[PDB]
Coordinates of C-alpha atoms and ligand atoms in Angstrom, one line a residue:
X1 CA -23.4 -11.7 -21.7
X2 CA -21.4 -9.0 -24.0
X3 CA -21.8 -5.1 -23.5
X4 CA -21.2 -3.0 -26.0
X5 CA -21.1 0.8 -25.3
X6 CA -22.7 2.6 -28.0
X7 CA -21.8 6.8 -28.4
X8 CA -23.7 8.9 -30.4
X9 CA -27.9 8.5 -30.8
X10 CA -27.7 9.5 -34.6
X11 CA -27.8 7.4 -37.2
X12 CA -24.7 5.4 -36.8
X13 CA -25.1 4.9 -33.1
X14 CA -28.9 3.9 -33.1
X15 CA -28.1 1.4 -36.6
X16 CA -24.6 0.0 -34.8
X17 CA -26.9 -0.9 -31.5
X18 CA -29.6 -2.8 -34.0
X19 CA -27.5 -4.3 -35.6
X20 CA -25.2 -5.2 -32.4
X21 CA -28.4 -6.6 -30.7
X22 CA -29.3 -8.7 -33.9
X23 CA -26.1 -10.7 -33.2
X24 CA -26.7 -11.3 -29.5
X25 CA -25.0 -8.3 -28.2
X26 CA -26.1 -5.9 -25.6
X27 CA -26.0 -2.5 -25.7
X28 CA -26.7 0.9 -24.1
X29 CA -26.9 3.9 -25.8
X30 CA -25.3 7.0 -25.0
X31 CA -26.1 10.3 -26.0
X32 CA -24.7 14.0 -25.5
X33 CA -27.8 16.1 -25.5
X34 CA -30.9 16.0 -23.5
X35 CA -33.3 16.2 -26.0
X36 CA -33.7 16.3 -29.9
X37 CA -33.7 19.0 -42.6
X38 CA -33.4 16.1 -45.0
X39 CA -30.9 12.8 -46.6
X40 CA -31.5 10.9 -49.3
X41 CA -30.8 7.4 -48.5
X42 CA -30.2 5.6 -51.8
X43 CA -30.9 1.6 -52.6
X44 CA -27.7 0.7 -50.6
X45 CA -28.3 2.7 -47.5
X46 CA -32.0 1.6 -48.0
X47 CA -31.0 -2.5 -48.2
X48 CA -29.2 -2.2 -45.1
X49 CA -32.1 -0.5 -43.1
X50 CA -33.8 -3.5 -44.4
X51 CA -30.8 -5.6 -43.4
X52 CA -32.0 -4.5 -39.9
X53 CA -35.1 -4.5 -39.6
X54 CA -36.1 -0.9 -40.2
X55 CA -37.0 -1.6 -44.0
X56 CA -40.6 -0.6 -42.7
X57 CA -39.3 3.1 -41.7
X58 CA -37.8 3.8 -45.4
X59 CA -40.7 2.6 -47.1
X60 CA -43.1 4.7 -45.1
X61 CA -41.4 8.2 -45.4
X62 CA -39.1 7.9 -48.1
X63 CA -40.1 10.5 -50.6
X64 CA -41.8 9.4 -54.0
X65 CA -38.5 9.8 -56.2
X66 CA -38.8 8.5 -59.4
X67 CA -37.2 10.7 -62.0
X68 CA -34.4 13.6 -61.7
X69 CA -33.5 16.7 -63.8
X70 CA -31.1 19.7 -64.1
X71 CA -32.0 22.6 -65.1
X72 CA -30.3 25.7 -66.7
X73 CA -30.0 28.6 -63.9
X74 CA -31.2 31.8 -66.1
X75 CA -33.8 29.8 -68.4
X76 CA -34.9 27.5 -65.9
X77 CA -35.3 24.8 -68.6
X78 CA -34.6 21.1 -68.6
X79 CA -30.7 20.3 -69.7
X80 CA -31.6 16.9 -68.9
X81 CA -34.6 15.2 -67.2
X82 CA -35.2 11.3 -67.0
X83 CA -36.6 8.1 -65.3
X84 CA -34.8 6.4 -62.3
X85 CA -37.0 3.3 -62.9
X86 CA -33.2 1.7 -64.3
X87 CA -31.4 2.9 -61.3
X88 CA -34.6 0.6 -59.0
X89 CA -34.6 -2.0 -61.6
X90 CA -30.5 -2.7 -61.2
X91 CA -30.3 -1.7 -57.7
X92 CA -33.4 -3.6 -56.2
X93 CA -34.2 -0.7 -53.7
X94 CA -35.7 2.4 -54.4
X95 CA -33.8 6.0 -53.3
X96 CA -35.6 6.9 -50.0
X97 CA -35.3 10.8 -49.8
X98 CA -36.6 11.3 -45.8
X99 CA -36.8 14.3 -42.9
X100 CA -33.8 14.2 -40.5
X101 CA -36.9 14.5 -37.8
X102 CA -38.7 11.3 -38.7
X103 CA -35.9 9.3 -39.2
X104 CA -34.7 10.5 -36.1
X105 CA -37.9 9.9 -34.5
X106 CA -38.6 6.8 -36.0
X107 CA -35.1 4.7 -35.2
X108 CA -35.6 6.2 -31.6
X109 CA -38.7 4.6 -31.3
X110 CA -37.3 0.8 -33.3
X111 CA -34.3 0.7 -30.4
X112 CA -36.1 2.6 -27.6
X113 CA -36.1 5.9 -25.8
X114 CA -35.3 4.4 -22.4
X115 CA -33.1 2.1 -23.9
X116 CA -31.0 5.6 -24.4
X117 CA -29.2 7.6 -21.5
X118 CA -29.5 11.5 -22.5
X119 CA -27.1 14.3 -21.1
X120 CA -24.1 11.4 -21.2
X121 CA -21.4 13.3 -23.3
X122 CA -18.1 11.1 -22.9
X123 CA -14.7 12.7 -22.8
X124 CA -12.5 9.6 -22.7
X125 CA -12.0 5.8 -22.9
X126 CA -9.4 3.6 -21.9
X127 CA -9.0 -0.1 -22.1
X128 CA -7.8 -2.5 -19.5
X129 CA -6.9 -6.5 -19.9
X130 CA -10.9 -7.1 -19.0
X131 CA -12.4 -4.3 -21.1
X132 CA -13.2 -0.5 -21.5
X133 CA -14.4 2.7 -20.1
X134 CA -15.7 5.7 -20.6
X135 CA -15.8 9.0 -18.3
X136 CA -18.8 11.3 -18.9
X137 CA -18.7 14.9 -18.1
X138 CA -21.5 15.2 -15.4
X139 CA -18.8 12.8 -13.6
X140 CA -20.6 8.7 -14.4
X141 CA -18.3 6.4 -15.9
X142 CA -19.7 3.5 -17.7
X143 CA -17.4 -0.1 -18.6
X144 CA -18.4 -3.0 -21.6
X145 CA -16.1 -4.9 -23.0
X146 CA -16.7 -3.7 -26.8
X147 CA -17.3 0.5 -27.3
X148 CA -18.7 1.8 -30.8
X149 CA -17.7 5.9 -31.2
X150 CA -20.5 6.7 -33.3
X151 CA -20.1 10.4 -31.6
X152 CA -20.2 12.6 -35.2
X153 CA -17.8 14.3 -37.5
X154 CA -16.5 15.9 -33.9
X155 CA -15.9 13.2 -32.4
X156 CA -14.6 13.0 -29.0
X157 CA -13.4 9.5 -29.1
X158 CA -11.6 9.7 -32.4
X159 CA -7.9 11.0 -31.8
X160 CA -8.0 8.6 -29.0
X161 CA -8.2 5.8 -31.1
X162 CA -6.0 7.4 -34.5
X163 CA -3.4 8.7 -31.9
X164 CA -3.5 11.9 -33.2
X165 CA -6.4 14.9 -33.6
X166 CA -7.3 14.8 -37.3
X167 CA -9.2 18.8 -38.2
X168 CA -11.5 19.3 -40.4
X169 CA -11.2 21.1 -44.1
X170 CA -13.4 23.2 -45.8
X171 CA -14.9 22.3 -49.0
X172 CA -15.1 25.9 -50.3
X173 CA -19.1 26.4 -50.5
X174 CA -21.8 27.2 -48.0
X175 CA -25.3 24.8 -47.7
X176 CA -28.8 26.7 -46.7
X177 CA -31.1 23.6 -46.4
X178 CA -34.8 23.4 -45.4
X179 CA -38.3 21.9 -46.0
X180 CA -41.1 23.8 -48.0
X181 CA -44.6 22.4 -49.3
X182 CA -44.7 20.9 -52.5
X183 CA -45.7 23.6 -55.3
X184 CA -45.0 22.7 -59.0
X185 CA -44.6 26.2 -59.5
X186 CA -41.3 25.5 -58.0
X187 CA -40.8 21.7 -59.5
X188 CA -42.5 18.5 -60.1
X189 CA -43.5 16.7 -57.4
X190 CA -42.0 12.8 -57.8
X191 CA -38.8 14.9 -59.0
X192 CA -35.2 15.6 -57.8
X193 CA -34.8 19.0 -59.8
X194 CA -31.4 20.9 -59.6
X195 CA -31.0 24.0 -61.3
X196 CA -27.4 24.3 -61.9
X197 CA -24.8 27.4 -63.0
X198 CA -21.8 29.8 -61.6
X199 CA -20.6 26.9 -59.3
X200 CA -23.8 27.0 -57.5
X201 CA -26.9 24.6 -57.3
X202 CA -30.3 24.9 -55.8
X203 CA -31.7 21.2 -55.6
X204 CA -35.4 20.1 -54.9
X205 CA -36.7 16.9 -53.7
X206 CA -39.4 15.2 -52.5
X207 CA -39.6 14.1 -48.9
X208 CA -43.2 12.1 -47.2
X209 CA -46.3 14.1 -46.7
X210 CA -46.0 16.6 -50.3
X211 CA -42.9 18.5 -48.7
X212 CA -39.7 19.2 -50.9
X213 CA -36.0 19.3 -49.7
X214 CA -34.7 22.0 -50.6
X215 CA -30.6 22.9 -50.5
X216 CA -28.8 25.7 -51.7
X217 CA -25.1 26.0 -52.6
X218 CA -22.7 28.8 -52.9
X219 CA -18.9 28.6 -53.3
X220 CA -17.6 31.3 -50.8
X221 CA -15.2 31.6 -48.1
X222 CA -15.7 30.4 -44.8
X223 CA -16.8 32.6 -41.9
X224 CA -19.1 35.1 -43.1
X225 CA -21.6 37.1 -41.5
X226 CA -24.5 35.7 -42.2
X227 CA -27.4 33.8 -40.0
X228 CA -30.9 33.3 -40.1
X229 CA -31.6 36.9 -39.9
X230 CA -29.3 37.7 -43.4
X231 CA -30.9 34.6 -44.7
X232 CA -33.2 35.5 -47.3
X233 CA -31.3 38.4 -48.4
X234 CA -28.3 36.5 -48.7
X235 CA -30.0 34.1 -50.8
X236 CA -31.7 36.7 -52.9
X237 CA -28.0 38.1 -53.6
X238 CA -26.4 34.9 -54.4
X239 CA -29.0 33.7 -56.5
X240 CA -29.8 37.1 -58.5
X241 CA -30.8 36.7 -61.9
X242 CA -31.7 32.9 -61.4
X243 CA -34.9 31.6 -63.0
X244 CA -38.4 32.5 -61.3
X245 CA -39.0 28.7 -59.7
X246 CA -35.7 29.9 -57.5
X247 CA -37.1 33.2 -56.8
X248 CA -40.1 31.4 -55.6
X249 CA -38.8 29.2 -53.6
X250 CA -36.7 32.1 -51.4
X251 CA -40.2 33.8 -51.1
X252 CA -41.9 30.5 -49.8
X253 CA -38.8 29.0 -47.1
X254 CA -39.1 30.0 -44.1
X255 CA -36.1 31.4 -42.9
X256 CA -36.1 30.7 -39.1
X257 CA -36.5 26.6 -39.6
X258 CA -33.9 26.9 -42.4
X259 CA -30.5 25.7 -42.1
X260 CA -26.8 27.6 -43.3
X261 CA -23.9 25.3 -43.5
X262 CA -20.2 25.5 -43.6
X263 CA -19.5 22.1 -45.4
X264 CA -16.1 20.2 -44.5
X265 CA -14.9 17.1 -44.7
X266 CA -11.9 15.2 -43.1
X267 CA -8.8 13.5 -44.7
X268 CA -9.7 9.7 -44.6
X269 CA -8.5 7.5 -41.9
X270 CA -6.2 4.4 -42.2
X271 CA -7.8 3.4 -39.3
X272 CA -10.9 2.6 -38.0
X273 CA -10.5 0.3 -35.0
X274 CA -8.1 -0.2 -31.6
X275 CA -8.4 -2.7 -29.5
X276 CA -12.0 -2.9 -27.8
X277 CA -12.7 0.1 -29.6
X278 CA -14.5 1.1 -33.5
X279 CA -15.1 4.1 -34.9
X280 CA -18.4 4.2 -36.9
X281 CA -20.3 6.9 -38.8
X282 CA -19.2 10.2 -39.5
X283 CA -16.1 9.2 -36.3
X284 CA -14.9 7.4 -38.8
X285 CA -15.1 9.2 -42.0
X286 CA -17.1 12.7 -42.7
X287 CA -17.5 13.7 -46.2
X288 CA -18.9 16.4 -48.4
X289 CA -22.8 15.1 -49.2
X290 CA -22.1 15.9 -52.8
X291 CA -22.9 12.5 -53.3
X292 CA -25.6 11.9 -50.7
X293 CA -23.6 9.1 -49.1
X294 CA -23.0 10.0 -45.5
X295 CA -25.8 8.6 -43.8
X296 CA -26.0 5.6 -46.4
X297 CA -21.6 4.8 -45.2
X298 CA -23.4 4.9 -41.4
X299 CA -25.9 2.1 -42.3
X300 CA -23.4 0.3 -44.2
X301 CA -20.8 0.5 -41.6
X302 CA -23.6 -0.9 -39.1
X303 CA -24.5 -3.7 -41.4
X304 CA -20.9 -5.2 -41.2
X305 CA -20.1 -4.6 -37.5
X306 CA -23.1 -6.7 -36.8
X307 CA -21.9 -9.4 -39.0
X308 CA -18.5 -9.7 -37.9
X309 CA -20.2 -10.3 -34.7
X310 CA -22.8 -12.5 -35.7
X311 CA -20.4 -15.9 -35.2
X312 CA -17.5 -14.8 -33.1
X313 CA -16.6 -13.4 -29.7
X314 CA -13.2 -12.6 -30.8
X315 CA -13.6 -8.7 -30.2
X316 CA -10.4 -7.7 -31.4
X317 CA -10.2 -10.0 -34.5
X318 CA -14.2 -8.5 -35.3
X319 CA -12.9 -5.4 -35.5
X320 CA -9.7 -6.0 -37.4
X321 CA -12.8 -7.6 -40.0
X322 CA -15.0 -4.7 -39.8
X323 CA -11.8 -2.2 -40.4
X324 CA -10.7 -4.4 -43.3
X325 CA -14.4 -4.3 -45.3
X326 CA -15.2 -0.5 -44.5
X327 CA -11.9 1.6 -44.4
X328 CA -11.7 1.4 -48.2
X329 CA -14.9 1.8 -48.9
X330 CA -15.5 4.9 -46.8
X331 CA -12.2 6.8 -48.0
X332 CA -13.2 6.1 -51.6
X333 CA -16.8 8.0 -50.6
X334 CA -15.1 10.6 -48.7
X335 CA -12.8 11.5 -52.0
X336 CA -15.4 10.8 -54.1
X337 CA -17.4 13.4 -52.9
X338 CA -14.9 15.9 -52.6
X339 CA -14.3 15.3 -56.9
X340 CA -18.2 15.8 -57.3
X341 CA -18.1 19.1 -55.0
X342 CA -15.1 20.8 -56.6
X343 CA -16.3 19.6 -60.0
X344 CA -20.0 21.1 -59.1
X345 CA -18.7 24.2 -57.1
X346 CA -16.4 25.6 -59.7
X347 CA -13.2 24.9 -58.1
X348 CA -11.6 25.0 -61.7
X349 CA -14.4 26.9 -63.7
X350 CA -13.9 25.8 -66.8
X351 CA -14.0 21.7 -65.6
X352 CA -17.5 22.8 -64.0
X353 CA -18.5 24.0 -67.4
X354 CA -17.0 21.2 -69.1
X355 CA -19.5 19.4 -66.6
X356 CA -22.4 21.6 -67.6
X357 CA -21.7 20.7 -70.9
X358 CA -22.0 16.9 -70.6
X359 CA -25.4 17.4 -68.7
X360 CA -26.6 19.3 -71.8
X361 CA -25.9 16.3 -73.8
X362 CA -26.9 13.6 -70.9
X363 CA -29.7 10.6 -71.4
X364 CA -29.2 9.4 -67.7
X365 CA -27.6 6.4 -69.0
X366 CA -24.5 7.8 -67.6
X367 CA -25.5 9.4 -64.5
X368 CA -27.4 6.2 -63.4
X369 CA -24.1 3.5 -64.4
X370 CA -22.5 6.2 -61.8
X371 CA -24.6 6.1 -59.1
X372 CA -24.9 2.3 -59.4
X373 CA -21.1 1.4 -59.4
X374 CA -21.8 3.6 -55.7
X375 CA -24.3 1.6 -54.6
X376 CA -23.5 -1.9 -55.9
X377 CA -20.1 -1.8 -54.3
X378 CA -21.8 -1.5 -50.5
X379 CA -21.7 -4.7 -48.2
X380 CA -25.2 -5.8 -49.5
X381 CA -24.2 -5.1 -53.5
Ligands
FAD401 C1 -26.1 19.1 -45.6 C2 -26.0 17.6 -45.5 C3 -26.7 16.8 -46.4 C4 -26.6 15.5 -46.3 N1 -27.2 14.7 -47.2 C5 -27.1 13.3 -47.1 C6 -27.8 12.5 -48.0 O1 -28.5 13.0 -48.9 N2 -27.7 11.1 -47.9 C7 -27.0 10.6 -46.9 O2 -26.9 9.3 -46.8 N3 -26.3 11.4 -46.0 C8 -26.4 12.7 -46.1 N4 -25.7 13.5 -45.2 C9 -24.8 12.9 -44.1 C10 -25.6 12.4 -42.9 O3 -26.4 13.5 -42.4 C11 -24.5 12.0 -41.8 O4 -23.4 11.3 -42.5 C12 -25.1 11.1 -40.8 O5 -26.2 11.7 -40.1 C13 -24.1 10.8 -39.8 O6 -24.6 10.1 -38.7 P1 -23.8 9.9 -37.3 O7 -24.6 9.1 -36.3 O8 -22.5 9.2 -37.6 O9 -23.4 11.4 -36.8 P2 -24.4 12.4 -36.0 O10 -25.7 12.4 -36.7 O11 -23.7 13.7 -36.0 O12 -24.6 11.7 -34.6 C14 -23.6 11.7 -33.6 C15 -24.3 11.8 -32.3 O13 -23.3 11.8 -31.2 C16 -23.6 12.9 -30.3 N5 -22.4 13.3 -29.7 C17 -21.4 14.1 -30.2 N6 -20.4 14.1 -29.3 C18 -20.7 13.3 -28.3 C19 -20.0 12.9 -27.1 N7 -18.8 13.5 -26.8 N8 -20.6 12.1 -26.3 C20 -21.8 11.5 -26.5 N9 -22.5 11.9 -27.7 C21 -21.9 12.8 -28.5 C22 -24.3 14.0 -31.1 O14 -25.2 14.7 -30.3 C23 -25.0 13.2 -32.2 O15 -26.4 12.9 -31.8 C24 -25.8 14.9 -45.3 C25 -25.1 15.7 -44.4 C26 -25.2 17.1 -44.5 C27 -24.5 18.0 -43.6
CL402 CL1 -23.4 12.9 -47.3

């Protein structure tokens, strides 16, 4: 009856195409590459998988998280360390910290890999009285009358439908991300353990199958030479002096399946929609992860594209709905990260030691009335 063209395989794309299909609508998936470390997907994030069917796929390989602590970066003891049984209690979801890979593998799997065309990488739409198409580079086209751009913080689609070629900014630190058996040497195990100091973070968290995520953060400029092969010894530089459970922990990664980073986000969007056409996902907003929200804005935005669907056929007026409920949302996320990062990062020193100075005095009360006004004011509250 209606096809929608769905862009991007990640987790917008694969959530939009659910969450399409719940309300009666075809799709086909398209996807760039031709084959193939970590997000925590907090209560909101995890209420909308639920929303759509894939409630089974958090429950399974979201990470035991049920407490959180900082710790100071030469001592290596707790400023503050507390339960997030509150945070489950008020939220109705528990935070679902989960491998990139399996919830890759595991959404693939809930839509379908045949259901998926691979080596499709679109380099243009346009829209007609009847509908819309799409031009590939290996020279297919493909036409639907509804297209979701789901195509990543890169997107290809994007200054087609803003009119103009938004760039991205960097955020002024540097991300080296990874997985590494659980070791309580390094941290407890049902823990999300940061050790915090000079603008720069080393964070620990538990993923499914005794395996912490691991991130580390440096402020520094963009475009240094560094790679997997400077890896460790960059680390070991950056993090000199930093209590032993750090030093551990760049003794135990393994360099080669770890990850470095440039983080940047993008200016938020007034729009989100033209005509036939929606941005979704990090298309249509990319933002720092300071607050872990990226992903969880994905889900959400899918959530509300399939309800604006769910009792009309009016494309156009769907997606003037589903502009209306997300654009605010995600640019308040966006900015909202980028406070936390410069606050955490040191772009004004002494407001990031103002901020180590309230975790010194912090009972969690605060942090967890923060991360709730986040979560309650998604689509599912
Ligand atoms: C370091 C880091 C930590 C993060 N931590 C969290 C977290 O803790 N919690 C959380 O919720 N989020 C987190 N995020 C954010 C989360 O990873 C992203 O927001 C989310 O994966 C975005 O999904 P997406 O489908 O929109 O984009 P992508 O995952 O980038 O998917 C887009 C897809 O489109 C494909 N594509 C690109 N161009 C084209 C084209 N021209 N044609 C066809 N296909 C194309 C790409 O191959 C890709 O598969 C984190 C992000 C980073 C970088
Ligand atoms: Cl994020």
């Amino acid at each position: 009856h209606m096809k929608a063209i769905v862009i991007g395989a990640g987790i917008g794309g694969l959530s939009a195409a659910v969450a399409l299909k719940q309300s009666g609508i075809d799709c086909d998936v398209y996807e760039a590459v031709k084959e193939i470390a970590a997000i925590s997907v907090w209560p909101n994030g995890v209420k909308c998988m639920a929303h759509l069917g894939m409630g089974d796929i958090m429950e399974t390989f979201g990470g035991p998280l049920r407490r959180m602590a900082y710790r100071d970066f030469r001592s290596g003891e707790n400023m503050t360390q507390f339960s997030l049984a509150p945070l489950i209690e008020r939220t109705g979801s528990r935070p679902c910290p989960v491998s990139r890979a399996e919830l890759q593998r595991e959404m693939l799997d809930y839509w379908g890999r045949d259901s998926v065309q691979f080596g499709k990488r679109v380099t243009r739409c346009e829209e007609d009285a009847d509908g819309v198409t799409v031009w590939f580079t290996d020279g297919s086209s493909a036409s639907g009358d509804l297209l979701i751009a789901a195509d990543g913080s890169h997107s290809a689609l994007r200054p087609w439908v803003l009119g103009f070629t938004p760039q991205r900014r960097y955020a002024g630190y540097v991300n080296w991300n990874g997985l590494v058996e659980i070791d309580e040497a390094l941290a407890p195990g049902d823990q999300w353990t940061t050790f915090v100091g000079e603008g720069k973070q080393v964070s620990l968290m538990p993923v499914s199958a005794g395996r912490f995520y691991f991130f580390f953060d440096v402020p520094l400029p963009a475009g240094l030479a560094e790679d997997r092969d400077t890896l460790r010894a960059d680390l070991s530089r950056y993090f000199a002096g930093w209590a032993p459970p750090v030093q551990k922990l760049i003794a135990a990664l393994d360099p080669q399946t770890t990850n470095r980073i440039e983080i940047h986000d993008i200016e938020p969007f007034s729009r989100l929609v033209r005509g036939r056409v929606a941005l979704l996902g990090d298309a249509g907003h990319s933002t720092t992860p300071d607050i872990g929200q990226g992903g969880c804005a994905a889900m959400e935005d899918a959530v509300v594209l399939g309800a604006v669907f769910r009792q009309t056929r009016d494309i156009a007026a769907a997606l003037r709905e589903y502009e209306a409920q997300r654009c605010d949302r995600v640019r308040d996320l966006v900015l909202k990260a980028r406070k936390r990062c410069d606050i955490t990062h040191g772009k004004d020193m002494q407001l990031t030691e103002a901020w180590y100075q309230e975790l010194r005095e912090e009972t969690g009360e605060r942090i967890i009335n923060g991360m709730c006004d986040t979560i309650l004011s998604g689509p599912l509250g």
